[PDB]
């Protein structure tokens, strides 16, 4: 408890009272860390409770199960479900463990010492102590350095993960030979983010996604030790602001950018977000239309190569602006697509005309007919067609919930950046309260 | 003096005695906006007609090609390019660049980078004068809106042709095609933004009336009332208790701000929060989460569908769905 006339901060900016209170602030993050785990456990058990394992997973309005199912729990070949007991365990595991975080969040926020500076010296910190901040930085870098390795160990030893590029439908594969070449790994980071290149969303095989985390597992274990034994250099003293709110706004600039990437990766990447589990992408469902409606000419026998459209461009197959054999219509904008139901139909010169007339597997059309129907475009009350579509079905894609939520969540943090990074720069200078009215700096300047 | 060449240079950029402040955002804002301005003028006057849809029917947008101010536009990049980075040097000839939708993607990339940094130097000067820094926050409400109509919406659709053209009649087509595909008027984020400006205009007409209506008598009647205020004065130019006393009688006393610092915060916070939702509106509508849809919703017994007004707005949308991009769709769905 705290009043207003001892701190100035009102009831609504109340959590800013515990900036200089180390111990109360520690209970504030622990209690909040309970609620993230508590949401993880409760929403998982809720989605298992309403889960029909015979319908596809993305049809039933599910977002947390395909996260667990991508790792390869209770899944078999093609994407179907073997058993739903491991989906029950993690919802139980997070929910009980949240109460352990819940008790420590209640404890330090009420009864534990409000400033753990002079009593507990390893934990006590002043916001200007630079060596102590780089320690508390460097400890946690190990904690998510090691956390990166759990995905690595589970992909090479513990059954592997669901690899949607498996031959003959997607299947769980143990990653045996992870691609750890630095020129291959760091080629994604300095790649352009525009179309055809796709900055980090275009990582297309499971060998790199597992192969990447060996780097990031090693680096912030190496970098975590670096910040423990070193202090920031005098150029970093000349560059940054060393307060408490300044450290926050540095983070808010980071996880604003984190949200925009997960906004785009769940919309485009059907490798870490497999289309059997999260539903098809926008580019996948649009390219599924022209493929399925080219099967509809093969049962009538008209020449798909000679099928000229109304504008003289090619009703079914046409040429890319870099000269490749692609589909036609308004889906010409999606010719950068690659998919495991489509890539066994492509040769050197794009998709092969001789191969498509003869070498269509039956299961490929069986998957590319679900993806014609379950295109991600829908309404807000979950109607699920174009805006000129009547109340018939009930489907909006999990890719469309994840791309919309994590855009807006990852947007206000950039507004969260511009709030605090201005305020922390002002309050470190002195004039966060206002103009002094005795020596304002405008009156000491030349006019105009 | 003993100062370096570099320190001479940094005590000129951050000098607050230039006529227009530059700052460190302005060293990359100014060469991006003057790029984007000087290419916008040329393509608004002399651009050859652009294939916008990839069906090789070029759309005119220049004043020299029989357009006026209203029908002039800078036509978006073609559908065949999509999201491929298409600078000037990837085109073989310069005229191949112009026909394919060249200067749209050159402007937007320099424009959006320019207005992210115009927000930057609104912070930077406010640190150079001892001001409190949150004007740069309030400029993020149009910056959120302009990032959506140029960049966030072509991502979710997959092509820069569906972005908004740089023209007055070009905008009006983008408003029509959008509501035909996404039904923006039945989305609560467009409802907040509409209240963001109808409330925003009301809060400017009402606030600006009462300050004018409480001015202290200092001039004659032949002289204008603006001559009572002299610049840089200390004493207050209008009675504040009288305006709260007036507006307290008008509706009731609890419905007014007596604290003028709490008043001017409310004038800033109402439209800025309102534009943030209508900026996030078509950001979420970019990823195909359209709005409400109450078609065939009121049904009685014996299975008969009663019209509402929502079925009338359906007929408007259904009349525009089957007319936009009139020679594009070979297939009975508009997935692109």
């Amino acid at each position: 408890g705290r009043d207003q006339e001892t701190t100035g901060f009102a009831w609504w900016s109340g959590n800013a009272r515990l900036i200089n209170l180390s111990g109360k602030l520690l209970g504030a993050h622990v209690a909040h860390a309970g609620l993230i785990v508590f949401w993880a456990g409760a929403m998982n058990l809720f989605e298992v409770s309403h889960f029909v394992p015979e319908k596809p997973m993305y049809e039933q309005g599910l977002i947390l199960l395909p996260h667990i199912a991508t790792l390869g729990y209770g899944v078999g070949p093609g994407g179907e479900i073997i058993d739903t007991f491991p989906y029950f365990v993690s919802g139980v595991l997070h929910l009980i463990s949240s109460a352990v975080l819940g008790f420590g969040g209640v404890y330090h926020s009420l009864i534990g010492p409000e400033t753990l500076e002079e009593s507990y010296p390893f934990f006590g910190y002043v916001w200007k102590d630079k060596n102590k901040m780089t320690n508390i930085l460097g400890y946690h870098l190990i904690m998510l350095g090691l956390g990166a390795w759990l995905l690595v160990w589970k992909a090479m030893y513990f059954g592997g993960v669901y690899d949607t590029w498996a031959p003959g439908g997607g299947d769980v594969r143990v990653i045996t030979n992870p691609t750890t070449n630095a020129a291959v790994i760091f080629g994604y980071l300095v790649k352009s983010p525009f179309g055809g290149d796709g900055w980090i969303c275009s990582v297309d095989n499971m060998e790199d996604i597992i192969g990447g985390h060996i780097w990031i597992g090693t680096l912030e274990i190496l970098g975590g030790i670096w910040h423990i034994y070193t202090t920031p250099w005098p150029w970093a003293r000349r560059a940054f602001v060393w307060s408490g709110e300044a450290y926050l706004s540095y983070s808010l600039g980071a996880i604003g950018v984190m949200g925009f990437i997960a906004c785009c990766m769940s919309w485009f990447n059907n490798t870490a977000y497999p289309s059997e589990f999260y539903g098809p992408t926008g580019p996948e469902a649009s390219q599924s239309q022209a493929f399925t409606f080219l099967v509809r000419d093969q049962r009538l026998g008209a020449n798909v190569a000679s099928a000229q459209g109304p504008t003289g461009l090619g009703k079914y197959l046409m040429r890319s602006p870099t000269g490749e054999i692609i589909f036609g219509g308004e889906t010409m904008r999606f010719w950068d697509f690659r998919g495991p139901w489509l890539e066994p139909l492509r040769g050197p010169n794009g998709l092969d005309l001789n191969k498509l007339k003869n070498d269509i597997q039956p299961w490929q059309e069986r998957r590319a007919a679900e993806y014609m129907t379950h295109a991600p475009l829908g309404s807000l009350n979950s109607v699920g067609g174009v805006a000129t579509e009547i109340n018939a079905v009930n489907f909006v894609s999990p890719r469309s919930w994840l791309a919309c939520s994590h855009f807006c969540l990852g947007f206000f943090f950039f507004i969260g950046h511009l709030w605090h990074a201005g305020r922390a720069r002002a309050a470190a200078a002195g004039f966060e309260k206002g103009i002094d009215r005795f020596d304002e700096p405008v009156l000491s300047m030349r006019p105009l | 003096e003993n100062s370096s060449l570099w320190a001479r240079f940094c005590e000129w950029i951050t000098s607050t005695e230039n006529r227009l402040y530059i700052g460190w955002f302005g060293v990359i804002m100014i060469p991006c906006l003057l790029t984007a301005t000087s290419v916008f003028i040329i393509a608004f006057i002399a651009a050859p007609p652009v294939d916008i849809d990839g069906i090789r029917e070029p759309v005119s947008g220049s004043l020299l090609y029989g357009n006026n101010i209203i029908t002039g536009a800078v036509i978006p990049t073609s559908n065949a390019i999509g999201l491929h980075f298409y600078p000037i040097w990837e085109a073989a000839s310069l005229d191949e660049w112009l026909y394919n939708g060249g200067p749209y993607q050159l402007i937007v990339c320099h424009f959006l980078l320019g207005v992210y940094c115009y927000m930057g130097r609104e912070w930077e000067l406010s640190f150079r004068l001892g001001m409190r820094p949150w004007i740069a926050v309030a400029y993020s409400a149009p910056v959120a809106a302009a990032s959506a109509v140029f960049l966030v919406y072509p991502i979710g659709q997959g092509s820069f042709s569906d972005g908004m053209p740089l023209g007055i009649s070009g905008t009006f087509n983008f408003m029509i095609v959008f509501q035909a595909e996404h039904n923006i008027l039945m989305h609560p984020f467009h409802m907040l933004g509409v209240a963001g400006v109808f409330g925003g205009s009301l809060f400017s007409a009402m606030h600006g009336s009462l300050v004018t209506s409480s001015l202290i008598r200092e001039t004659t009647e032949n002289e204008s009332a603006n001559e009572g205020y002299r610049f840089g004065q200390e004493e207050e130019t209008y009675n504040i208790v009288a305006a709260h006393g007036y507006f307290g009688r008008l509706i009731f006393q609890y419905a007014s701000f007596n604290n003028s610092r709490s008043l001017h915060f409310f004038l800033a916070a109402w439209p800025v929060i309102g534009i943030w939702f209508t900026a996030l509106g078509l950001s979420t509508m970019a990823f195909n989460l359209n709005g409400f849809n109450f078609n065939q919703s009121v049904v009685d017994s014996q299975g008969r569908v009663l019209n509402t007004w929502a079925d009338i707005i359906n007929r408007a949308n259904l009349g525009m769905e089957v007319m936009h991009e009139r020679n594009a769709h070979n297939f009975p769905l508009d997935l692109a």
């Binding site: 006019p447 105009l448 | 006529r19 227009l20 006057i45 004043l63 020299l64 029989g66 006026n68 101010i69 002299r230 610049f231 840089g232 004065q233």
Partner: peptide, 30 residues
Amino acid sequence: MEALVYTFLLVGTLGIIFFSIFFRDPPRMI
């Protein structure tokens, strides 16, 4: 013909915007 009448009135507006910034009436204090 009107294509040059339009461009007069566009750069005419940009004329005043040049003169309204640099040749403005300088606000003298007090």
